[PDB]
Every structure is written in structure tokens, then in C-alpha cells.
């Protein structure tokens, strides 16, 4: 058995399924993690960050919403999330600031709704660093 089979799927669309990958970089609660061919079976919670599937050829990088990641004993990593995001040609700085700024005003609004605003701030700030 050479390589590791990746299974990156979503509740609306499936990207990778039993596909061999050289390396993957997905943010974890404990901290940023990396995986290669043979990797010790670890089960960590994925936080709203950025994942990058590596290949012998140029590797593509997509933004992830969050979920779980588990590396099966048989050398098989499984990534589960909600929504996905392409390189940068998909997101727009202008489209982000609009809501982003409105989030700070949600703290001003009733706390019941401001609770979700705090969670948005984080995700939004990370979107800016993706611009690179």
C-alpha cells in the first residue's frame, strides 16, 4: 500500500473520494496539522481555516468551513465539512467588508444575535489572510 487515500466530501458536493495524495494541510483545534503517506491514526476537530491538497504537480488550496478529520489505520484520511471555497477567484474583498463591518454592529444589537457575531469575526479575519 503506497500513498494515502483522501476522502474530501460535503453535504452538497464531493471533491475527493479514494484519491491518493502526497500531502495535506488542514487546521486543527490543537493546531495546524500535516499528513503524508503513512501517518499515525489521529482524530482531531477541524476549525474554520484553510486546507491545501498537495500533489506531485502544483497543489491546489481551498478554504474550509470546519468539521472533523480522521486518519484511518489503513492510511486513509477523511475530511468532512460543510461549505468549500476555491483559491481566491471566488471570494471578493469588497463582498466581505460589507458584512464584516456589520458584524461589529451585531455586538451592538441584542446579545442573542451578537453571540453569533463573535463567531463571525474570527472566520472573517482569516479570510483576509487568504488574500496573501
Amino acid at each position: 500500500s503506497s500513498g494515502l487515500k483522501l476522502q474530501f466530501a460535503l453535504p452538497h458536493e464531493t471533491l475527493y473520494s479514494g484519491s491518493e495524495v502526497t500531502q495535506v494541510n488542514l487546521p486543527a483545534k490543537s493546531g495546524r496539522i500535516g499528513v503524508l503517506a503513512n501517518h499515525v491514526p489521529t482524530v482531531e476537530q477541524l476549525l474554520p481555516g484553510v486546507v491545501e491538497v498537495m500533489e506531485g504537480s502544483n497543489s491546489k488550496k481551498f478554504f474550509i468551513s470546519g468539521g472533523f478529520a480522521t486518519v484511518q489505520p489503513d492510511s486513509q484520511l477523511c475530511v468532512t465539512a460543510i461549505e468549500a471555497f476555491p483559491l481566491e477567484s471566488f471570494s471578493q474583498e469588497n463582498i466581505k467588508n460589507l458584512l464584516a463591518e456589520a458584524k461589529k454592529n451585531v455586538s451592538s444589537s441584542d446579545a442573542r444575535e451578537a453571540a453569533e457575531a463573535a463567531i463571525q469575526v474570527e472566520v472573517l479575519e482569516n479570510l483576509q489572510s487568504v488574500l496573501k
Binding site: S30, G31, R32, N126, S129
Partner: protein, 76 residues
């Protein structure tokens, strides 16, 4: 003067023991920066600058005990 001169060398070799705080101390402070970026590659130009600040703080113990040796060999 001979008995008091000999104490100048004995006291200088002991003041070097106080420099362990800078060897192991600065080690831990710098080691945290290495283990931090492995957990959060995003934040770099924020932890790096403060990391250097911790250096001068831990370098203190490596300067005071260092001056004590010169005040017993080239000072007195």
C-alpha cells in the same frame, strides 16, 4: 598579597554557574516560538517581536553573572 589573591580566581569560577539561567532560560523562551508557529503559522510578525523582548529579559542573568567574573579577574 597572596591568600586574598587566590580567592579572586576561586570566586570567578563560581560566578559562571549563575550563567545557567541564560542557557536554559533563553532556550525555553526561544523554544516556545518554535512550537507556537507549528500550531499557528498565521501569527508570525506578532510573536516574533515579543519573543526577542523575552531574550533581553533572560539575557540579564547572563550579563550580571558575566560581569562578576571580570570584577574578580580584570577588576577587583
Amino acid at each position: 598579597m597572596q591568600l586574598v589573591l587566590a580567592a579572586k580566581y576561586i570566586g570567578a569560577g563560581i560566578s559562571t554557574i549563575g550563567l545557567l539561567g541564560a542557557g536554559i532560560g533563553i532556550a525555553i523562551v526561544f523554544a516556545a516560538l518554535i512550537n507556537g508557529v507549528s500550531r499557528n503559522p498565521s501569527i508570525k510578525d506578532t510573536v516574533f517581536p515579543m519573543a526577542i523582548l523575552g531574550f533581553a529579559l533572560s539575557e540579564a542573568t547572563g550579563l550580571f553573572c558575566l560581569m562578576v567574573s571580570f570584577l574578580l579577574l580584570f577588576g577587583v
